[PDB]
Amino acid sequence: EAEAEFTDACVLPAVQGPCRGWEPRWAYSPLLQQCHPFVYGGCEGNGNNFHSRESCEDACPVVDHHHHHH
Incomplete structure (x- = not known):
């Protein structure tokens, strides 16, 4: 897939x-x-919730x- 293959909240x-x-949030x-x-x-939502473009790409x-993938 991408290099991020473990399913993180992102x-x-x-x-x-x-x-x-x-x-307004970032995902x-x-x-x-x-x-x-x-x-x-x-209120209630998933963990893919960022404060900025920065913090999100930083995550x-x-x-x-x-x-590492095919």
């Missing part, structure tokens, strides 16, 4: 939650191999593809 899609307030997308902003709800960074 590999997991993000969620808003049952709330109705809209809190990593392995399908985009990058982080993007998203609408979050400030799941890109490195040169020293393919």
